[PDB]
Every structure is written in C-alpha cells, then in structure tokens.
Amino acid sequence: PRLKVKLVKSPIGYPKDQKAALKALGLRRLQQERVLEDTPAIRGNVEKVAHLVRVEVVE
Template sequence: MARVRITQVRSTIDRPQVQKNAIKSLGLGKINRSVEVEYTDAMKGAIAKVQHLVKVEEI
C-alpha cells in the first residue's frame, strides 16, 4: 500500500463541522502540521472532504 504525507495548509476556522472532523481523523489540527499515513480508501475519503485545506505528497 502506498504511503502519503498530508500537510495542513489552511485553517479550519469558519469551516463546517464535517471538515473539522475530517482534519481530526487525519491526525492534523494546526497549520503546517504533517502526518504520514497509508493511502487507504478511508484516507482517500477524508482527504477528498478537505482537499482545499491540505497538501498531499506521495512518499
């Protein structure tokens, strides 16, 4: 399975609760924080909800 690095680049202030929950589920919460995760279907869904708030890089 592929691994990706996800970096939060925009704030969740004034965003819907669904997007805030997706950011939390990815392990983020502050701007410029990064996590490395397996690129599973669940991660793809969470990333799709907040694609405008994060940057995704394949490792």
C-alpha cells in the same frame, strides 16, 4: 505507498464535518505533516479537506 498530508489552510469557518475530517487524520495545527497509509477511508477524508491541505504520495 503512503500519504504525506500537510495542513496549510485553517479550518476556522468551515463546516464541522470538515473539521472532523481533519481530526480523523490527526491534524490539529497548521503546517503540520502527518504520514498516513493510502487506503480509501483515509483518502476520502483527505479529499474532503483537500481545499485545506497539500498532499504528496511517498515511499
């Protein structure tokens, strides 16, 4: 399985660690999708910024 993560809500105004979380996922721009492996370390960051993101389980 992999994770398809989409940045749908802007990080402007959220704590820096949440902004950092987007950076560990390699997310820079809104509406941008990145496909990442589903390991716990990746998923922890995904769940941190879940209020900023839309996630789908794929392949």
